[PDB]
Design a protein around this nucleic acid. Structure first.
Ligand SMILES: [Mg+2]
Ligand SMILES: [Mg+2]
Ligand SMILES: [Mg+2]
Ligand SMILES: [Mg+2]
Ligand SMILES: [Mg+2]
Lengths: 127, 98, 78, 60, 206, 24, 155
RNA sequence: GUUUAAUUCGAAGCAACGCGAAGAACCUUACCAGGCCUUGACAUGCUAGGGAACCCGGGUGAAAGCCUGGGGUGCCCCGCGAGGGGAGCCCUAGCACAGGUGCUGCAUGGCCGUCGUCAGCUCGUGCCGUGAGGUGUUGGGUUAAGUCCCGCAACGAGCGCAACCCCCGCCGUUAGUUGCCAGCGGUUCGGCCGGGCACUCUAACGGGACUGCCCGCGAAAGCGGGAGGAAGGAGGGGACGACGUCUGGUCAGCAUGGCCCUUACGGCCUGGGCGACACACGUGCUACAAUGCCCACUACAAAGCGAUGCCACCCGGCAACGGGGAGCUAAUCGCAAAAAGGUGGGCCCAGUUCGGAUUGGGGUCUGCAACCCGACCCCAUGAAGCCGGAAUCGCUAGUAAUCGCGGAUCAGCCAUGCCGCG
């Protein structure tokens, strides 16, 4: 009666749950409209709809789990498309060529000994 | 019913043991939900390689502790015999809680 | 910061309370410092070491919360 | 002061006032761990050896 | 000077530890405490037989100690007035389940320390280094081995200088994991002083 | 001396555990 | 940076308008790793010329851009046995990147207490040809095309 | 460097200078001053007196040390008995002795750094040369690379690059004390419950990426691609550091030759010192502000840690904190509140509601004890600081900057430095 999506970027977790509704899109309660009040990338989290000309259509339950805020958004920009394909699989050639169906993994670098912020070596003094 | 975890710094000695315990009941009594892998706990120790001035060039060690869990759903009076009978394990410690 | 309770070293009272069975003298040669300047003792002079010698001072009413180790300077530069 | 200081770290004299540590084999003062009782030296020259259970060399 | 401890690089894989037991939180040192003197007790008492390894089996209360020596005919005693009295006289510091083993050795000259043990023993006596290793790194390879390497350094000839030495034939891929190479730690107190006798013995793969 | 013996300055150099911190 | 000629990063276009050029500028004003805090300035400025006049804040943006992209410029280069400077044209991509960083750094100089004020002005004042970003633009050409005589290297 | 009595020693361009220190209030401590001890603070062995062992105390003495006291009196060769002996342990005397952070890293072992993650170091056969030796490793091209290709009197290999190891990107299974109304039944409408294991998450083994295919280019390796695929040409980090130079660094982590010290160059205590300051440099910390600064309200972590410890919570406290005490020997309990973020009001350019150095007074908070030589907080005092010369530093991607969260030694103690996390 619905389709599920997974979305992990920058070690974030945001369970994505698509249903065929009309206009309910919230997150753990709160309200995605106003959970994310004051953003800029906010519209960018729902992109695979206006790019498929189908925003005024389905509905979405959302669960997030930890992770970074932008990483919480950028992961949502996946589980949408990382759903639907189960019984709505023709949603591909107007996505992957345009370039959405990818994790874009960019995990941080760990701090390393003998350095500072992982790659900034200390000041160097020949004198 | 009775509760046991399994703690070992090496999963190979732990998983096998965890696979070993299942033999003394799951093939002695009712089915048992398989091992329950806890998130592995680490004791992360990084030490300066050098013995003197060279403070950098350090090297890192870990004393990982792999924790796993097994719960029996029907404590069978005959299977428990098969437990203590298994006095051939490995260098791993386990506890029994109620 | 001397909280609920103040202090002063033991043999000090040995070396300073016998100075009052008759309100006694002033001469002394001891070895403590971290003690508290005793409001009940603003009437003597106390031998306080520095590093090589004991350098004392006449005690004065105002000296209370401060420590006996301040009147004996150590790093001879000033 | 090699064989003269560790002995002090036994009798426990003055109050909780001089309670410090001491590596076993290396007998070294600081850089000692309360887990192994070994200086950062007297640990490696057994860690790399292997007399230190589960103490592999990290990697991540 | 580089190349960190090959075994120290092995360790957590291939060759497993020279001991074996889990330990709890605050009982680790408490067990390690007397665990080390167990080894330290024998590395000059059990020596005249060629010691190369000593496991430690524990889990709780009972301790099983297994030794790996090549010449057991003297550590065992004329009938037990050694191996069975070494156990009893071992609890005196650690009242534990006194257990022992003695694993045989079919080919001594294939364990890295035993060479370095033999070399230092041979180095102590006024012997020809360069031509006590050449014989050695050959009889290693002779005993079915397939690679070796035995480096020593110190006061060769007692001269004021201190050049190391070489004696090797074949492949010793130290940097590879599956190689399985044992490593020898020796020591030689001498007339002039202290030496440094090492040894690598490649063995196989997979 | 930030974080040592007898002043008042600052403790992002001395720590605080065991110092005066709650134990039991 | 000697052998292979590297790869130009390709950027995420804007959401509001439909052009990479927009994002190409908002990330440029971004400081201290503060991203949303920058698009306000831009879009708060956008929502001024909408009220200033019937000039769309984008369909004008690009004109001062083409009023800040120069043509030919100099470059310091060592020859002979001392130090001189060499002129040339301008790489088109560089011409673009040169413009943006020219634009933003003109903000903080403008005497404006708030924020987006520092933005739109240097944009607008350069929409006809009387802006700071124009001065520093032509000055290079003033420092460049005055060196027409260096006709041997050039390449 | 300067000085004090001591300001212990080492470290010396790149390889020293938030380095040995991941523990300079006393001890740590190695330095100074004074007091005292000399078979000891330690180990093995012998002789003699008293005694077993071992607990407790006092006077004095700064402490140590010195003197003294009460008890108590074991295990083995005899003898019930008055009484002989012995092993261990302790104190007092003679010893053998040990002991020293004393010296030489230019006498060493081990360990470490640099070149340097540079890409080189070589062998077997053959060939050229009387021979040492050369070739192979050189030439063109390519790459991170002696990586690889063409050619080449050379052809192959070993050490090294890589790869086999670890963490992340994807997925499958196993397994469900975290999680879940994604479907239902009670809900103080909390995942609290019944309940379930797809999903979340966790940790074991595995498939997967090999220029595999296709459109072209350069013969060749290789290149512009493109599709599929999560990722495509090494996907991105870790650990791994060859032959060898630096007669490199370390007798101060340790062992050790040789010289020396042994009534002290050994040992214990109180105090003082490495924090001393006309100066100068190294590495960092806040800034010198409107993308800014305060106040109130409103969400998201990743990792790490802890029972004789972590501290919810209740009250008290105008605050660091105090009394009581839930839970947790640990995916449960907690440390723990994360900041930038969003809303809303103020401040409208000022030396400022920017910054907190100094300093007066006042506090709680750990331990025998907090002046030189602790925080946090209150009333303030509120300095220079308006972007910095010659120069010079790191950084090619989730990197740079910015914002915050842990760990490691510990009775307290050098933890804004270090190592990890987001
Ligand atoms: Mg391995
Ligand atoms: Mg992916
Ligand atoms: Mg050297
Ligand atoms: Mg601040
Ligand atoms: Mg407050």
């Amino acid at each position: 009666e619905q389709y599920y999506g997974t979305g992990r970027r920058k070690e974030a977790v945001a369970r994505v749950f698509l249903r065929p509704g009309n206009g309910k899109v919230t997150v753990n309660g709160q309200d995605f409209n106003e959970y994310f009040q004051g953003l800029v990338r906010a519209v960018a989290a729902l992109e695979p709809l206006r790019a498929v000309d189908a925003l005024g259509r389905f509905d979405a339950y959302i669960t997030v789990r930890g992770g970074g805020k932008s990483g919480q958004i950028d992961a949502i920009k996946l589980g949408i498309a990382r759903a639907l394909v189960q019984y709505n699989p023709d949603y591909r050639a107007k996505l992957k060529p345009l370039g959405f169906l990818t994790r874009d993994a960019r995990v941080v670098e760990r701090k390393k000994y003998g350095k500072h912020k992982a790659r900034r070596a200390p000041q160097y003094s020949k004198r | 019913k009775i509760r046991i975890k399994l703690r070992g710094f090496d999963h190979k000695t732990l998983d096998a043991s965890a696979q070993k315990i299942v033999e003394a009941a799951r093939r002695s009594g009712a089915q048992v939900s398989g091992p329950i892998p806890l998130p592995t706990r680490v004791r992360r120790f990084t030490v300066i390689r050098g013995p003197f001035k060279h403070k950098d060039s350090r090297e890192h060690f870990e004393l990982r502790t792999h924790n796993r869990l097994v719960d029996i759903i029907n404590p069978n009076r005959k299977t428990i015999e098969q437990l203590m009978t298994l006095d051939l394990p490995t260098g791993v410690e386990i506890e029994i809680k109620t | 910061s001397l909280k609920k309770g103040v202090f002063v070293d033991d043999h000090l009272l040995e070396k300073v309370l016998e100075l009052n069975a008759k309100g006694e003298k002033r001469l002394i040669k001891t070895w403590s410092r971290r003690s508290t300047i005793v409001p009940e003792m603003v009437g003597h002079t106390i031998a306080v070491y520095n590093g090589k010698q004991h350098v004392p001072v006449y005690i004065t009413e105002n000296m209370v919360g401060h420590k006996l180790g301040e009147f004996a300077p150590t790093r001879t530069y000033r | 002061a090699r064989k003269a200081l560790i002995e002090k770290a036994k009798r426990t004299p003055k109050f909780k006032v001089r309670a410090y540590t001491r590596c076993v084999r290396c007998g070294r003062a600081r850089s000692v761990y309360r887990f192994f009782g070994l200086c950062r030296i007297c640990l490696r020259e057994l860690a790399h050896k292997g007399q230190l259970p589960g103490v592999r060399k990290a990697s991540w | 000077g580089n190349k960190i401890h090959p075994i120290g690089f092995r360790l957590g894989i291939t060759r497993d530890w020279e001991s074996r037991w889990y330990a709890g939180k605050k009982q680790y040192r408490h067990l390690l405490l007397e665990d080390q003197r167990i080894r330290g007790l024998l590395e000059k008492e059990l020596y005249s037989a060629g010691l190369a390894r000593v496991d430690i089996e524990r889990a709780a209360d009972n301790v099983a100690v297994t030794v790996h020596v090549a010449k057991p005919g003297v550590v065992i005693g004329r009938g037990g007035e050694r191996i069975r009295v070494l156990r009893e006289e071992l609890a005196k510091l650690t009242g534990k389940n006194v257990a022992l083993n003695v694993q045989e050795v079919q080919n001594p000259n294939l364990s890295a320390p035993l060479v370095a043990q033999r070399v230092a023993e041979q180095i102590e006596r006024r012997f020809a280094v360069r031509r006590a290793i050449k014989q050695a790194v050959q009889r290693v390879m002779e005993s079915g081995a397939k690679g070796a390497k035995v480096i020593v350094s110190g006061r060769i000839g007692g001269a004021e200088q201190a050049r190391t030495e070489w004696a090797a034939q074949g492949r010793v891929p130290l940097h590879t994991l599956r190689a399985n190479i044992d490593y020898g730690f020796a020591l030689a107190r001498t007339t002039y002083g202290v030496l440094g006798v090492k040894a690598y013995i490649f063995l196989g793969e997979v | 001396g930030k974080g040592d013996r007898r002043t008042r300055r600052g403790k992002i150099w001395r720590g605080t555990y065991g110092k005066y911190r709650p134990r039991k | 940076a000697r052998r292979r000629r590297a790869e130009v990063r390709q950027l995420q276009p804007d959401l509001v308008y439909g052009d990479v050029l927009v994002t190409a500028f908002i990330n440029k004003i971004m400081r201290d790793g503060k991203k949303n805090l920058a698009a306000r300035i831009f879009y708060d400025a956008c929502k001024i010329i909408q009220e200033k006049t019937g000039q769309e804040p984008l369909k004008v943006f690009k004109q001062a851009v083409e009023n800040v992209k120069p043509r030919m410029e100099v470059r310091s280069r060592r020859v002979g046995g001392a130090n001189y400077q060499v002129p040339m044209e301008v790489s088109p991509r560089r011409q673009q990147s040169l413009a943006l960083r020219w634009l933003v750094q003109a903000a903080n100089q403008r005497p404006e207490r708030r924020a987006a004020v520092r933005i739109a002005h240097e944009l607008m004042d350069a929409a006809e040809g009387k802006g700071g970003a124009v001065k520093k633009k032509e000055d290079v050409e003033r420092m460049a095309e005055a060196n027409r005589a260096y006709a041997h290297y050039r390449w």
